[PDB]
């Protein structure tokens, strides 16, 4: 018989996940940044420079956007790209972590 | 704070946000309705017209192909990004090039 | 039969009489800028 | 006036308030020709 609802169901809070990072030699996505990814990296870095201002860039620029662009082009940007591949029903979150300081940059300057 | 209500500050303190005027070289989103194509919103470099008698948005006639526009009475919208994140995205993604 | 106090009001008009093909209902364009649609 | 009449049409909640938006910091004017401006420039 199908009786009254129990506490075992009715949970609204989804269970926590485990971040599963694909080993670097098994990554399938491209080693080249997309234009979306490079734009997002530059925007995030520029906003964080507007917050902090601390950079390891040798040259001097008057705008956060210029500093972020030169950090991306000179491979000195302190950010990582996480490409979420899958969410497994057993709880795992399989992702790929990409280092933009050793990827191909599509942008020009 | 308004800028007329403060005049005793010799300089600005690091961390403040200054809302400055739009100058030549700023990027702007430039839109004509109906927005049927992806080029219906494009980012242009602003040239400020110093003549106070000019009230129109002026553009090159070869830029009309992006917006399906002409000069028989069309009106186009223009907003200038102010946040850094949207102002980065205007240059790198939405430029009319 | 001669009374007119309770006559139908809608009967004083001319008796009798899914998407509008000409209505801009799915077109989100400002009503102040409709000259963009001029045939030119 | 009803709660569920706010939703449906083009002037309703979904199409006017959620899928579109009134915004600040925006301008509009008649457009004009100028042959001294580059293709990526706006006067
Ligand atoms: Mg016209």
UniProtKB/TrEMBL annotation, chain A:
Transmembrane parts of this sequence: none
Gene: C147L CDS
Species assigned in the record: African swine fever virus (ASFV)
Task performed by this protein: Component of the DNA-directed RNA polymerase (RNAP) that catalyzes the transcription in the cytoplasm of viral DNA into RNA using the four ribonucleoside triphosphates as substrates.
Name assigned to this protein: C147L
Shown segment, full-protein numbering: 39 to 147 of 147
Gene Ontology biological process terms in this record: transcription by RNA polymerase I; transcription by RNA polymerase II; tRNA transcription by RNA polymerase III
Nucleotide-binding among keywords: no
Superkingdom of this protein's organism: Viruses
Family membership: Belongs to the archaeal RpoK/eukaryotic RPB6 RNA polymerase subunit family.
Keyword Calcium set for record: no
Swiss-Prot/TrEMBL keywords: DNA-directed RNA polymerase, Transcription
Gene Ontology CC annotation, any one: DNA-directed RNA polymerase complex
Sample GO molecular function, one term: DNA binding
Subunit structure: Part of the viral DNA-directed RNA polymerase that consists of 8 polII-like subunits (RPB1, RPB2, RPB3, RPB5, RPB6, RPB7, RPB9, RPB10), a capping enzyme and a termination factor.
UniProtKB/TrEMBL annotation, chain B:
Coiled coil: none
Listed transmembrane segments: none
Assembly mode: Part of the viral DNA-directed RNA polymerase that consists of 8 polII-like subunits (RPB1, RPB2, RPB3, RPB5, RPB6, RPB7, RPB9, RPB10), a capping enzyme and a termination factor.
Function statement: Catalytic component of the DNA-directed RNA polymerase (RNAP) that catalyzes the transcription in the cytoplasm of viral DNA into RNA using the four ribonucleoside triphosphates as substrates. Forms the polymerase active center together with RPB2. Part of the core element with the central large cleft, the clamp element that moves to open and close the cleft and the jaws that are thought to grab the incoming DNA template. DNA-dependent RNA polymerase catalyzes the transcription of DNA into RNA using the four ribonucleoside triphosphates as substrates.
Similarity section: Belongs to the RNA polymerase beta' chain family.
Protein name stated in the entry: DNA-directed RNA polymerase subunit
Organism annotation: African swine fever virus
From TrEMBL, chain C:
Source domain of life: Viruses
Protein's name in the database: M1249L
Gene source species: African swine fever virus (ASFV)
From TrEMBL, chain D:
Family statement drawn from the similarity comment of this UniProt entry: Belongs to the RNA polymerase beta' chain family.
Gene that produces this protein: NP1450L
Source species: African swine fever virus (ASFV)
Function: Catalytic component of the DNA-directed RNA polymerase (RNAP) that catalyzes the transcription in the cytoplasm of viral DNA into RNA using the four ribonucleoside triphosphates as substrates. Forms the polymerase active center together with RPB2. Part of the core element with the central large cleft, the clamp element that moves to open and close the cleft and the jaws that are thought to grab the incoming DNA template.
Subunit structure, as described in the record: Part of the viral DNA-directed RNA polymerase that consists of 8 polII-like subunits (RPB1, RPB2, RPB3, RPB5, RPB6, RPB7, RPB9, RPB10), a capping enzyme and a termination factor.
Entire protein: shown range: 297 to 339 of 1450
Classification lineage: Viruses, Varidnaviria, Bamfordvirae, Nucleocytoviricota, Pokkesviricetes
Name of the molecule in the record: DNA-directed RNA polymerase subunit
């Amino acid at each position: 018989i199908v009786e009254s609802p129990s506490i075992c169901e009715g949970f609204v809070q989804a269970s926590s996940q485990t971040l599963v990072i694909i080993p670097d030699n098994e990554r399938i996505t491209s080693n080249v940044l997309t234009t979306f990814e490079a734009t997002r990296l530059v925007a995030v870095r520029a906003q964080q420079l507007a917050i902090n201002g601390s950079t390891m860039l040798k040259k001097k620029y008057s705008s956060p956007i210029d500093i972020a662009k030169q950090e991306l082009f000179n491979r000195k940007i302190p950010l990582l790209v996480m490409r979420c591949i899958k969410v497994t029903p057993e709880g795992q979150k399989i992702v790929e972590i990409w280092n933009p300081r050793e990827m191909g940059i599509p942008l020009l300057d | 704070h308004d800028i007329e209500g403060l005049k005793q500050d010799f300089r600005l303190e690091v961390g403040d946000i200054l809302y400055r005027d739009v100058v030549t070289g700023d990027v702007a989103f430039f839109n004509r309705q109906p927005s049927l194509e992806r080029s219906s919103i494009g980012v242009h470099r602003i040239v400020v017209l110093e003549n106070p008698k000019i009230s129109t948005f002026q553009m090159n006639v070869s830029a009309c192909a992006w917006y399906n526009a002409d000069f028989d009475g069309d009106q186009m919208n223009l907003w200038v990004p102010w946040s850094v994140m949207s102002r980065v995205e205007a240059e790198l993604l939405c430029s009319v090039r | 039969g001669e009374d007119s106090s309770m006559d139908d009001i809608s009967a004083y008009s001319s008796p009798g009489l899914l998407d509008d093909p000409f209505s801009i209902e799915d077109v989100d364009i400002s009503l102040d800028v409709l000259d963009n649609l001029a045939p030119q | 006036p009803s709660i569920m009449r706010r939703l449906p049409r083009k002037e309703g909640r979904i199409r006017k308030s959620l899928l579109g938006s009134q915004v600040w910091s925006i301008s509009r004017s008649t457009i004009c020709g100028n042959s001294d401006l580059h293709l990526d420039e706006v006067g």
